[PDB]
Amino acid sequence: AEVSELKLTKDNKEVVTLYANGNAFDKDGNQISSGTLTLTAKFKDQYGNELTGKVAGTDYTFESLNPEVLVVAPDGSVTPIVPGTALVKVKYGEVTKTIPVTVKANPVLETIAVDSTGVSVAKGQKATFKVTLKDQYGNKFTGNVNVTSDKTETATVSVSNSGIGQSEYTVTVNGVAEGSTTITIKSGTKEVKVPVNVVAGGPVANYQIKVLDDGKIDKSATESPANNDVQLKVYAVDANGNIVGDITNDVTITSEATDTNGVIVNASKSTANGDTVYVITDNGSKKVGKETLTVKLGTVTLGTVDVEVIDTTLKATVVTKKADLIELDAADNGDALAKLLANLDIKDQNGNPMVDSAATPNTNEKLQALKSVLSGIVSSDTSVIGSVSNVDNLKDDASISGLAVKKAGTVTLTLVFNEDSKIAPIAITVKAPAATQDGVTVTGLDLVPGVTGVGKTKFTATDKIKSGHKLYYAVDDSAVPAPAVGTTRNSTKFANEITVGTTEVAANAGQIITVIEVDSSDRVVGYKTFTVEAADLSVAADKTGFTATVTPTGGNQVTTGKTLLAVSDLANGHKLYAAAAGSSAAAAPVKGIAYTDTTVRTTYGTEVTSGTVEVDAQDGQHISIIEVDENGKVVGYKDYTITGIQIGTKS
Ligand SMILES: [Ca+2]
Ligand SMILES: [Ca+2]
Ligand SMILES: [Ca+2]
Ligand SMILES: [Ca+2]
Ligand SMILES: [Ca+2]
Numbered sequence: 001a002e003v004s005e006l007k008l009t010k011d012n013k014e015v016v017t018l019y020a021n022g023n024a025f026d027k028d029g030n031q032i033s034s035g036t037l038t039l040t041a042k043f044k045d046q047y048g049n050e051l052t053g054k055v056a057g058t059d060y061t062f063e064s065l066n067p068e069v070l071v072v073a074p075d076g077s078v079t080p081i082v083p084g085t086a087l088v089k090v091k092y093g094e095v096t097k098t099i100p101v102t103v104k105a106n107p108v109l110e111t112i113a114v115d116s117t118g119v120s121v122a123k124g125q126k127a128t129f130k131v132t133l134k135d136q137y138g139n140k141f142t143g144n145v146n147v148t149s150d151k152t153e154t155a156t157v158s159v160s161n162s163g164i165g166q167s168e169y170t171v172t173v174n175g176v177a178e179g180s181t182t183i184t185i186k187s188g189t190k191e192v193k194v195p196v197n198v199v200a201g202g203p204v205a206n207y208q209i210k211v212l213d214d215g216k217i218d219k220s221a222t223e224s225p226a227n228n229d230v231q232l233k234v235y236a237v238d239a240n241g242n243i244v245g246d247i248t249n250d251v252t253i254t255s256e257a258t259d260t261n262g263v264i265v266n267a268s269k270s271t272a273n274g275d276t277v278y279v280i281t282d283n284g285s286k287k288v289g290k291e292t293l294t295v296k297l298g299t300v301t302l303g304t305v306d307v308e309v310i311d312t313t314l315k316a317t318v319v320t321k322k323a324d325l326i327e328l329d330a331a332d333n334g335d336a337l338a339k340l341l342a343n344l345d346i347k348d349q350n351g352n353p354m355v356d357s358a359a360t361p362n363t364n365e366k367l368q369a370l371k372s373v374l375s376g377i378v379s380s381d382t383s384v385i386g387s388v389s390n391v392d393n394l395k396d397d398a399s400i401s402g403l404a405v406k407k408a409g410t411v412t413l414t415l416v417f418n419e420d421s422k423i424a425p426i427a428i429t430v431k432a433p434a435a436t437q438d439g440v441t442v443t444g445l446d447l448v449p450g451v452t453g454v455g456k457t458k459f460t461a462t463d464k465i466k467s468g469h470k471l472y473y474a475v476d477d478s479a480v481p482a483p484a485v486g487t488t489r490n491s492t493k494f495a496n497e498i499t500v501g502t503t504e505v506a507a508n509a510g511q512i513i514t515v516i517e518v519d520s521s522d523r524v525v526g527y528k529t530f531t532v533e534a535a536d537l538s539v540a541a542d543k544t545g546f547t548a549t550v551t552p553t554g555g556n557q558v559t560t561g562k563t564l565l566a567v568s569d570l571a572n573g574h575k576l577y578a579a580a581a582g583s584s585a586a587a588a589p590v591k592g593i594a595y596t597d598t599t600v601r602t603t604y605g606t607e608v609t610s611g612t613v614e615v616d617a618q619d620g621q622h623i624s625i626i627e628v629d630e631n632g633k634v635v636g637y638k639d640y641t642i643t644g645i646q647i648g649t650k651s
């Protein structure tokens with residue numbers, strides 16, 4: 001064999017970055033918090049076949065060659081300890097592999113970034129700039145904040161959200177008195193200073209447009225942090241680039257008269273404390289993209305700015321088929337939806353997998369995911385599998401369905417994705433094989449003559465059947481088409497059950513018997529066609545089966561009213577029985593039946609095997625006789641016609 005894969009993962013995400021605190025990330029620097037941290041591993045045999053269904057913690061273990069740094073439990077689970085480089089290893093029979101792993105030091109406040117170099121505001125008005133906390137790596141870092149002015153009488157200051165619980169705060173510098181001073185920032189150990197110069201300017205000219213937030217709205221229903229808005233404010237500035245006033249309330253903003261990009265929104269002023277803000281919100285929006293906004297001061301037009309709509313969380317995007325074919329078995333139970341889905345890899349915007357988790361037993365994610373992007377499916381043959389117009393017909397509450405099976409055959413199912421996903425159709429071939437002998441448990445099945453009547457036959461075999469299964473049959477002058485495997489028993493065609501070595505069927509020679517073997521859930525697995533050979537059928541006895549030559553006899557040595565039955569040359573252990581003497585012959589039983597049958601023993605109740613017997617009789621009366629074999633079975637039958645010549649006389 002050969003180990004084909006050895007990955008570090010947490011909730012089906014290949015980890016790249018890991019910290020000592022146990023917090024991990026993907027490739028896109030996105031944190032992971034679902035599932036357990038573990039080591040993924042896959043194995044291939046010597047030919048290149050992936051081994052599966054194996055036990056993690058029995059068929060293959062795990063160890064950490066550097067436990068001073070990191071523990072890797074045998075099952076596969078992981079719990080890091082301290083920063084460093086650690087080695088990990090796997091076992092299976094006699095294999096072995098190894099890969100490095102690295103625990104990074106926990107993030108710590110390194111840099112305090114700034115969105116300016118020196119602030120300048122008008123007396124009485126208020127200014128603004130951003131701050132970004134960065135760790136030693138240069139990524140975002142959460143922490144608290146304190147801000148102060150060296151000269152509050154000259155310039156006060158305020159910060160949002162209490163200056164706690166984020167990695168991005170907004171500073172708000174309210175300009176008090178004319179002069180120059182400095183603002184001191186404080187977070188943890190480190191400190192940063194901002195030069196401030198309040199100036200009493202105000203010759204208008206030049207208008208600015210400021211985007212406070214990310215400048216985006218997420219039309220997804222669970223974006224975090226809550227990003228369902230864009231926050232704006234209009235400022236008048238002087239020539240020297242210093243804010244002199246706010247006029248957000250005296251301005252008219254307008255989008256296009258009618259949508260042209262599927263990006264639709266609504267603007268609205270939200271006044272409070274004399275401080276006016278212009279808020280943007282979603283108005284439906286079918287698509288993502290930019291939407292330019294036109295500012296106006298009553299009738300003028302000042303400047304334009306573009307906002308951006310997005311939809312996130314998770315949206316199916318990439319899809320690939322593995323094989324250009326699948327062939328079904330009984331385990332599919334007659335619904336080609338299960339095995340189909342397995343022949344498809346799905347990945348989201350991030351090229352990240354999407355799967356039906358077992359945490360959601362009665363609902364499929366990979367399915368429900370595909371439902372959102374699928375438009376239709378076109379079966380090449382509807383008589384085999386029904387095409388899909390409506391997608392809401394697909395569902396998974398354990399019963400994963402349904403591309404139901406109608407008939408045995410082979411088809412082409414092409415899928416129709418939305419133009420939204422821009423995903424080209426993907427064709428898959430599907431074989432629906434008909435049942436055959438291969439799926440038959442009961443061995444050595446052939447037909448034999450019946451014993452109930454004539455023109456009939458019987459079933460029999462060697463071993464018994466896999467407990468739970470059953471048999472049904474049909475018959476016509478032609479053969480019945482074999483059904484697709486997994487199909488339910490067409491209880492209309494096949495309704496006649498078979499209990500082996502008992503049930504029997506009326507039929508003629510040249511005809512055809514079709515059969516099927518069902519499972520516990522009444523699904524087809526087997527199929528075998530019998531042609532009726534004339535010898536397989538049953539018939540009544542004749543003089544043919546009658547071997548012995550019997551001679552009715554009278555004379556002056558036999559009792560009157562009675563006749564002597566002279567037996568001559570029968571076979572070894574064969575026996576003979578006689579019926580009542582009537583004016584008409586008795587009924588002739590079937591060849592093969594036992595003597596012990598009630599309809600028989602009652603009729604032919606008089607054994608005369610000895611040939612030394614005499615029973616009542618008359619001239620034209622008839623008498624019926626039968627021949628039994630060495631095993632207690634009937635063989636022959638001959639109805640004699642008597643004459644007075646062979647009747648007794650004297651007393
Ligand atoms: Ca939203
Ligand atoms: Ca926002
Ligand atoms: Ca638009
Ligand atoms: Ca699930
Ligand atoms: Ca036969």
Ligand SMILES: [Zn+2]
Pocket residue numbers: 438
């Ligand atoms: Zn076979």
Ligand SMILES: [Zn+2]
Pocket residue numbers: 476477478
């Ligand atoms: Zn017919």
